[PDB]
Amino acid sequence: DLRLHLLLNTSVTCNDGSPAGYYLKESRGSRRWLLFLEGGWYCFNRENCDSRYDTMRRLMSSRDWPRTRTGTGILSSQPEENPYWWNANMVFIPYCSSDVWSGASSKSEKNEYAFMGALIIQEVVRELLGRGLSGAKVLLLAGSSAGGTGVLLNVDRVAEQLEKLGYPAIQVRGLADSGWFLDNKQYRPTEAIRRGIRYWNGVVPERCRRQFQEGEEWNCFFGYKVYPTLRSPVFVVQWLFDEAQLTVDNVHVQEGLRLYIQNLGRELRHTLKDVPASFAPACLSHEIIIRSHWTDVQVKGTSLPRALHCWDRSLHPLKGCPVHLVDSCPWPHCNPSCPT
Ligand SMILES: C[C@H]1CCCCN1C(=O)N1CCOCC1
Ligand SMILES: *[C@@H]1O[C@H](CO)[C@@H](O)[C@H](O)[C@H]1NC(C)=O
């Protein structure tokens, strides 16, 4: 069980002005810290956000959050469930800003909602330093789906924050799960993100912003465009046939659709060729790192917990302990270890 703490700075808020927060389970024998960003789509205008407030309110408000949460997958403290980091300090940061973790806008007489995702991450880090994060040797910022994209948008800002506060010894790293999308043509999207960025006052990493320039910041939401600009080490986990990617592509089998699906897997593989820490199985699925059975899937005979352990060793190629693992077979579930 991870225990809830509402932010002491009550001006850093969820969408409806209630305080944001985090769930924590400390491990005082460990100098490793895992901060996980929840996912859950987003909203991009007044009418769409009002609908989300009616039926997805826990993603917009802390008023109904429970006092505890069970850690699962990479957040589990049991070695059998989490071979990688079972002894780490565990943090789950609820997603209550509806802005893919990019926003920096308060509620006001001109704004019905607050979009503060980027500031929530910064404030959680600041308040954790008093609870033991000051002694860390590794801070791993992880996340799934919208939270995976949030890792790519925020990992370098956390590194800069800790350096400027005077903690140069904490190594900041990222783990992005199911947050690596393609801006491809549909079988039968980017405009919603463009409108969202303006609605949220959304912010993107500085080097990527300088490349694409004013009005084109939406480009930095796409992994293959923002990843080369990042300085912190980032491990990318991405199913080749991700269900959210197919949903946005309007895919729900004849020759035209067969070619479309094969092309999607080929393009995704291409974008990961120069990503040296990555795990990309040929499966139709969505998210992995906080699922209890995340230990089951393998690429070339290597599980995800093993690949992550090999990554840790590389940050001290390694015989028998690979870090770049991308399937080459071209159809969903051509890998026999895919979830069923
Ligand atoms: C999965 C969601 C939430 C997080 C960012 C990526 N997401 C999108 O819905 N997108 C991205 C751009 O292309 C299609 C629209
Ligand atoms: C609380 O957060 C807001 C927004 O980041 C910031 O302007 C303010 O300085 C913070 N308060 C304190 C005491 O740090």
Domain boundaries, the chain: 1-340
Q: Residue 132: count other Cβ atoms within 10 Å of its Cβ.
A: 16
Contact present, 288 and 304 (Cβ < 8 Å)? yes
**Among 283, 325, 305, residue whose Cα is nearest residue 74:** 305
- Give me 198's structure tokens: 């303006």
Integer-rounded Cα radius of gyration of the chain: 19
Contact present, 285 and 238 (Cβ < 8 Å)? no
Give the integer Cα–Cα distance in Å for 43 and 50. Answer: 9
Contact present, 223 and 271 (Cβ < 8 Å)? yes
Greatest CA separation for the chain:
60
Beta carbons within 8 Å of 81's beta carbon, 6+ residues apart? 72, 73, 292, 295
Ligand nearest the Cα of residue 106 is: 2
Ligand nearest the Cα of residue 287 is: 1
- Reported structure resolution in angstroms: 1.5
The rounded Å distance from CA 74 to ligand 2 centre is 31
Residue with CA at minimum distance from ligand 1 atom 2 = 41
Helix (H, G, I), strand (E, B) or coil at 63: coil
Helix (H, G, I), strand (E, B) or coil at 144: strand
104 lines ligand 2 (CB under 6 A): no
Instruction: Check if 242 is active-site.
Output: yes
- Give me 260's structure tokens: 């479309």
H/E element holding 117? helix 117-129
Contact present, 269 and 159 (Cβ < 8 Å)? no
12 lines ligand 2 (CB under 6 A): yes
11 lines ligand 2 (CB under 6 A): yes
- Give me 3's structure tokens: 């225990």
Q: Give the burial string for 268-305 (b: 16+ CB within 10 Å, else e).
A: bbebbeebebbbbbbbbbbbbbbbeebbebbbeebbbb
- Give me 332's structure tokens: 């969903």
Pocket residue to mutate for ligand 1, from 181, 187, 219, 225, most atoms within 8 A of Cβ = 181
For CA atoms 51, 52, 56, 60, the dihedral sign is negative
Give the integer Cα–Cα distance in Å for 100 and 144. Answer: 11
Q: How was this structure determined?
A: X-ray
Q: Which amino acid is present at 145?
A: S
Contact present, 299 and 335 (Cβ < 8 Å)? yes
Length of the chain: 340
Pairing of strands 171-177, 138-144: parallel
The rounded Å distance from CA 44 to ligand 2 centre is 25
Give the integer Cα–Cα distance in Å for 229 and 206. Answer: 9
- Considering 286, 303, 324, 327, which one is annotated as catalytic? 286
